[PDB]
Structure 1
C-alpha cells in the first residue's frame, strides 16, 4: 500500500499473504496482511472493526484495517517469531517445562479475555502463536475465522491443517462454542511436551479416527448427544481409551489432570480458560525468557 514499504514476505496463509512492512508516516514495523470480489462484505468489515477495540497483552494488536480500492489490508503489531518455528528450533533439547507452563498460562489469559467477550478464535495452531524476546506469547488472527468463514485450501491452494480441530466441528456441529479453543490449546500443549503432534490427521476422517484410537470412540455415556451429530455414523469402529501416561510422557500428574480436562469430548464438560488458570499445574508458574535467535 502507498503508506507502507514492504520489507519481506513473512508467509502465506489461508487468509492471504503476510509482509513485514514499515509504516512511512510512522517508521514503525508492522505485519501487513493482504486479505485473500464484489467490493468486500460489509458484514466482514464490521466484524473486523469490532476487533480493533479488543486489546489485551496476550493478543496480537490489530492496529489498522484498510479497505481501499475495495481491498482489505490488516495491519497488526509485528512479532519476530511464531511458536512453530520455535519448536522446530528446540526439537532436540525440547522447550523447557517452566517455559511451557508460562506460555500456556499466558495463552489461557488471552483466551479467557476473548471468551468473556464472546469472541472465539476457532483456528488455533502453532503458526498463530507469536513470541518475543521477553518471554511473552500472543494469539494472532483472533476472530478472523468469524469474519471470513474458514476455507479448505489457503489463499495459495495449500491444504489447511485439521490437527487442532475439535471433534464437534469434525462431527458436523454448526454451533460450536468457546470450548473449541480449549481443545486446540490442549493439542498444542501436548505437542510442546512430547515434541510431536498429538493427532496429525490428513483428512477429516483420518483426523477423527486418530482422536478415537487415543481417547476412545465416544458414546452416549461420555458424550450425551454425540450419536445424533450430523456426521456421526453407527459404523464407526470402537476403540478403547489409551492411558494418558502413555500419551504425554513425561508430564506430571497436575499437567496430565489439566490436559484431560482440556480434551473432554463433551464441549460442556471441557474446562473453561478461566477455570484452567486456577489449576494446581500453575501453582509455580514463572516468566522465563526464551532462547531466541533472530
Structure 2
C-alpha cells in the first residue's frame, strides 16, 4: 500500500470502503477496495485475475499484507445508480438502455461460460464510461468472500427467487434474474421489486409475477423456505409492468424473469433475441 496515494473515498461497497487512488510509481489511477484471510479466498480471487473481458471491470492486482486484503481494480467514472438518478427527469434513452443490456449480457455470457457467477448484480456494481461502455464490477467476489446481510443493508432488490426460497445450489441463472430487474428499472425509472425484508422481497415478486406453483415451476413447493400458506396472487401483464417497452423488450424481459431457473433464458440466447436486431452503441451525457 505504500505504493498508492488515496485521492478520495468513492464510497462503501459490499466488502469495505472503496477509494480512488493513484499509484506512486506508474501514476495509474485505480479503485482500491479494502476487504473487511483464508487460503480458499486468496485462491479464488487469484483465479479472477485471468477472467478478462471488455465488459468486466479489470482486476489489476490483489494485495495481502499484515493480514489485510486490498483488491486493485480498473477505475471508471460513475456507476449506473448515479447515472440513473442524474437521468431521472427524462429517463435513459432506449437505444442506450439497449446498448447497456447487450454489453452486460456479453459480460455474463463470458463469465458464465467459465462457470463463474456474480451473484450480486445491482446498479452500484455496474460502471460506465464516456465512450458508451458498461462493465460489471465485483464479479466472483461473492463465492470468494460470501454475501453478508450488512456491510449498510445489503439490498435484496435484485435477488432471484430460488435464492430467497433457500435453494443451496443455484446457478448462473441468478445473474440473468438480477439483470432483468435492472433492465426494468432503467426503463421505468423505478426499482421493480424494492423489498425491505426477505418476505417482503418474495411477496413483491409474487404480487407482480403470480405466486409460483408446480404448474409454472416444478419442484418449487419442495424448496426449503417455501410455505403452502404463501398468499396466492395472480400474475400481471408485462404491459402494466414496464409500459413504455415495446413487445420485443417485454418478450425478452419475461424470459429473463421466468420463475424456473432451468427455463430462464441464458445470456448467450438472450444476445440472439430479436430485441437486439437494431442495437447500437450511443454515448451518454456524463458530467464528471
- TM-score interval, normalised by the smaller of the two chains: over 0.9
Question: CA offsets per residue over residues 45-79 of structure 1, 9 Å max, x none?
Answer: 00000000000000000000001112110000000
Q: Which residue of 2 aligns with 1:265?
A: 259
Counterparts of 1:13 and 1:130, CA distance in 2: 13
Structure 1 unaligned spans of 5+: none
Counterparts of 2:164 and 2:144, CA distance in 1: 20
Q: Which residue of 1 aligns with 2:114?
A: 117
Question: CA offsets per residue over residues 21-43 of structure 1, 9 Å max, x none?
Answer: 0001110100000111xxx0000
Counterparts of 1:71 and 1:209, CA distance in 2: 40
* Cα shift at 1:14: 2.1
Q: Which residue of 1 aligns with 2:3?
A: 3
Q: Does the residue aligned with 1:32 lie in a helix, a strand or coil?
A: strand
Q: Which residue of 2 aligns with 1:100?
A: 97
* Cα shift at 1:218: 0.3
Q: Which residue of 1 aligns with 2:281?
A: 287
Counterparts of 2:74 and 2:194, CA distance in 1: 30
Counterparts of 1:87 and 1:174, CA distance in 2: 33
Counterparts of 2:100 and 2:157, CA distance in 1: 20
Counterparts of 2:236 and 2:282, CA distance in 1: 33
Q: Does the residue aligned with 2:250 lie in a helix, a strand or coil?
A: helix
* Cα shift at 1:9: 0.5
* Cα shift at 1:13: 1.8
Q: Does the residue aligned with 1:73 lie in a helix, a strand or coil?
A: strand
Q: Does the residue aligned with 1:65 lie in a helix, a strand or coil?
A: strand
* Cα shift at 1:95: 0.1
Counterparts of 2:237 and 2:69, CA distance in 1: 47
Question: CA offsets per residue over residues 178-212 of structure 1, 9 Å max, x none?
Answer: 00000000000000000000000000000000000
Counterparts of 1:126 and 1:258, CA distance in 2: 20
Counterparts of 2:229 and 2:66, CA distance in 1: 52
Confirm or deny that 1:62 pairs with 2:59. Answer: yes
Q: Pairwise CA RMSD of aligned residues?
A: 0.4
Question: CA offsets per residue over residues 140-182 of structure 1, 9 Å max, x none?
Answer: 00000000011000xxxx1110000000000011100000000
Question: CA offsets per residue over residues 78-130 of structure 1, 9 Å max, x none?
Answer: 00100000000000110000000000000000000000000000000000000
Q: Does the residue aligned with 1:283 lie in a helix, a strand or coil?
A: helix
Q: How many residues align?
A: 287
- Name segments (4+ residues, structure 1) moved above 3 Å: none
Counterparts of 1:73 and 1:32, CA distance in 2: 7
Structure 2 unaligned spans of 5+: none
Q: Which residue of 2 aligns with 1:165?
A: 159
Counterparts of 1:283 and 1:204, CA distance in 2: 37
Counterparts of 1:279 and 1:79, CA distance in 2: 29
Counterparts of 1:20 and 1:14, CA distance in 2: 16
